[PDB]
Paper text:
The two antibodies with 4 or 5 cysteines ([name]-5 and [name]-6) both used a cysteine pairing pattern. The knobs of antibody [name]-5 and [name]-6 form one-layered structures without the second layer seen in antibodies [name]-1–[name]-4. [name]-5 and [name]-6 have relatively short [name], which might be due to deletion mutations in the region encoded by the DH2 segments. DH2 deletion mutations have been observed in bovine ultralong [name], contributing to diversification of bovine antibody repertoires. Interestingly, deletion mutations in the region encoded by the DH2 segment in [name]-5 and [name]-6 reduce “two-layered” knob structures to “single-layered” ones. However, electron density associated with 4 or 3 knob regions of antibodies [name]-1 or [name]-6 is mostly or totally absent, suggesting that these ultralong [name] are highly flexible. The structural flexibility of the stalks, and the hinge regions between the stalks and knobs, explains the lack of the electron density in some knob regions of these Fabs.
Consistent with the five structures solved previously, the 7 new CDRH3 structures also showed a long “stalk” formed by 2 anti-parallel β-strands supporting a compact, globular “knob”, further establishing the stalk-knob configuration as the general structural peculiarity for the ultralong bovine [name]. Each of the knob structures starts with the conserved sequence motif [CP(D/E/A)G(Y/W)], in which the initial cysteine residue forms the first disulfide bond with another cysteine residue in the knob, and the motif forms a type I β turn. The compact globular folds of the knobs are maintained primarily by several disulfide bonds, a feature that is similar to the core of other small disulfide rich proteins or domains such as voltage-gated sodium channel antagonist mu-conopeptide, CnIIIC.
Author numbering:
A (entry chain A): 2 to 25, 29 to 73, 76 to 116, 130 to 173, 180 to 231, 238 to 260
B (entry chain B): 2 to 9, 11 to 217
Write the structure that this text describes.
C-alpha cells in the first residue's frame, strides 16, 4: 500500500491552501496531520467512509476537508506564516465505543436496570502515514534552480549541485529511483543573496540525477559522468 | 492543547529508557494512547496503538503502558537506530479529535566516534561558462556532530564568501554537513590549490583541488 500527497508547495499569506491525497481507498478513513518546523505534530482533521468529518477545535473554522469516494482534499483558508509545515496524509482508525460495566446492559434513544453512568472510550490511531509534502507560506518569489554536474578532479564520487533557488523544497532522485544504494542528499544552505543551495552526491566503488523544484514546476534531468582524465 | 512530554531523554547503549506522556482525563483518561516515532528522512512510524498493542513490524523492546492519566513508552536494549523523536497521541471528547504530545528526543549515549568523510568537488565546466565558480565540500558520517571547517588557498586561510551548513543528523545516527565556496570565475583560476580542511575531535581531514591539474 502506498500513499501520495499532491498540491502546491508555495502559498502566499492571506490565501486559501488546497491539497489532495490519493492512495491505492474505502477500507479505513483518511486523515490529515501537519508538523510545524521545530514543533509537535498537529491533528488537522479526517473523514470516514460515511462522510462524517471531524476537525481540530482550535482551527475548525479555518480548515475544511472534502471527499469524493478516492481523493480526500484538505483546504485551510486564510494561510499565514505559521501554516508553513509538512502536511502528511494518513489513514487513521476511528471508533467510538460506549462502554457499560459488568452486566451487559446498554441503551440509548433518549441486572437489567442499572444506575452506573455510561462512559465511552474513543479509539484513535494512525494506521499508515504518507511520505509528506512541505508547503511554504511567504510572498517571496519562485526562483528556479540551476543544476550543475559534479565530478572529481583525478571509490568514485559524483553528484549534482542544486544552486541558486527559492523557495524550499527540492527532491533529488538519482536514475528516477533506480539508484538508491549510495545516494546522499545534503540539506540546503542559505547564502547571502537569499537563495538556497543543496547538493546530492552518489558514491560508486569502481548516472543521471533528476532534480525537481515544485514551486517553479521544474523537473530538470542532468546526466553526470566522471572526467576523462 | 498538547500532551506533556519530556523535552530530552538520554539513555545508554543497550540500556532501558522510559518516556512519560502526562495527560488528563479527557484524553489519556480515555484508555487509547498511541505512540509514534519520527526518524529524520523517513515518514512517521506508528509504534503502539491502544495503550499496549504493538503495530506491525515493531520489536518487543517497544512496550507501551498507562496508569490512569499517564501513559509511558519503554524502550529496552536501546540501539543507535532508536534515536528519533517520539510522540504520544490519544482522542479527546470525540473519535475524530486527537491531541499529540510535545515530543521527546531520544539520544542514545555510548556510541563510538567516527572520522568525517570529506569530498571536495571543483566548479563544473558548465558553471564556469557563466563567469561563476562554486566549490562544494561535502562532509558525511561523523560522530559526534561537532565539525569545524576552514578553507585555504595555497596555504592562505580563506574567510570571505564561505557559507557552511550546520551538522544535520543522518539516518544512521551519524551527522553530515556541507560547505560552499562561491567564487568568481577569475578567482577560481587565480590560485594553485584549494583545500577544504575539516577538523573533528582533533583528527583533521583535508581534501585539495588544483585548477591546473583538474580538467
Amino acid at each position: 500500500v502506498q500513499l501520495r500527497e499532491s498540491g502546491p508547495s508555495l502559498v502566499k499569506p492571506s490565501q486559501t491552501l488546497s491539497l489532495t491525497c490519493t492512495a491505492s481507498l474505502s477500507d479505513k478513513a483518511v486523515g490529515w496531520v501537519r508538523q510545524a518546523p521545530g514543533k509537535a505534530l498537529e491533528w488537522l482533521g479526517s473523514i470516514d467512509t460515511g462522510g462524517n468529518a471531524g476537525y481540530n477545535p482550535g482551527l475548525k473554522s479555518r480548515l475544511s476537508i472534502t471527499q469524493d469516494n478516492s481523493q480526500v482534499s484538505l483546504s485551510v483558508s486564510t494561510v499565514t506564516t505559521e501554516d508553513s509545515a509538512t502536511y502528511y496524509c494518513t489513514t487513521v482508525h476511528q471508533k467510538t465505543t460506549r462502554n457499560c460495566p459488568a452486566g451487559y446492559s446498554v441503551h440509548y434513544d433518549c441486572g437489567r436496570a442499572s444506575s452506573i453512568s455510561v462512559t465511552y472510550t474513543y479509539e484513535w490511531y494512525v494506521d499508515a502515514w504518507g511520505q509528506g509534502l512541505l508547503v511554504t507560506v511567504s510572498s517571496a518569489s519562485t526562483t528556479a534552480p540551476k543544476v550543475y554536474p559534479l565530478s572529481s578532479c583525478c571509490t568514485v564520487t559524483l553528484g549534482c549541485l542544486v544552486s541558486s533557488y527559492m523557495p524550499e523544497p527540492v527532491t533529488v532522485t538519482w536514475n528516477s529511483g533506480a539508484l538508491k544504494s549510495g545516494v546522499h542528499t545534503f540539506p540546503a544552505v542559505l547564502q547571502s543573496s537569499g537563495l538556497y543551495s543543496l547538493s546530492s552526491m552518489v558514491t560508486v566503488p569502481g548516472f543521471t540525477c533528476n532534480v525537481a523544484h515544485p514551486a517553479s514546476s521544474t523537473k530538470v534531468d542532468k546526466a553526470v559522468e566522471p572526467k576523462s582524465c | 492543547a498538547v500532551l506533556n512530554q519530556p523535552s530530552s531523554v538520554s539513555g545508554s547503549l543497550g540500556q532501558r529508557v522510559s518516556i512519560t506522556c502526562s495527560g488528563s482525563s479527557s484524553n489519556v483518561g480515555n484508555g487509547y494512547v498511541s505512540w509514534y516515532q519520527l526518524i529524520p528522512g523517513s515518514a512517521p512510524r506508528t509504534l503502539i496503538y491502544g495503550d499496549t498493542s504493538r503495530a506491525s513490524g515493531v520489536p518487543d523492546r517497544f512496550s507501551g503502558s498507562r496508569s490512569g492519566n499517564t501513559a509511558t513508552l519503554t524502550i529496552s536494549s536501546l540501539q543507535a537506530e532508536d534515536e528519533a523523536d517520539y510522540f504520544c497521541a490519544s482522542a479527546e471528547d470525540s473519535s475524530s479529535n486527537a491531541v499529540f504530545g510535545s515530543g521527546t528526543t531520544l539520544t542514545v549515549l555510548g556510541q563510538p566516534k567516527s572520522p568525517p568523510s570529506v569530498t571536495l568537488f571543483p566548479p563544473s565546466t558548465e558553471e564556469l561558462n557563466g563567469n561563476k565558480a562554486t566549490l562544494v565540500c561535502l562532509i558525511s558520517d561523523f560522530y559526534p556532530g561537532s565539525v569545524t571547517v576552514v578553507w585555504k588557498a595555497d596555504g592562505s586561510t580563506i574567510t570571505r564568501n564561505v557559507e557552511t551548513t550546520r551538522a544535520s543528523k543522518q539516518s544512521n545516527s551519524k551527522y553530515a554537513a556541507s560547505s560552499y565556496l562561491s567564487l568568481t570565475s577569475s578567482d577560481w583560476k587565480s590560485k594553485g590549490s584549494y583545500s577544504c580542511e575539516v577538523t573533528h575531535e582533533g583528527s583533521t581531514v583535508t581534501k585539495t583541488v588544483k585548477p591546473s591539474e583538474c580538467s
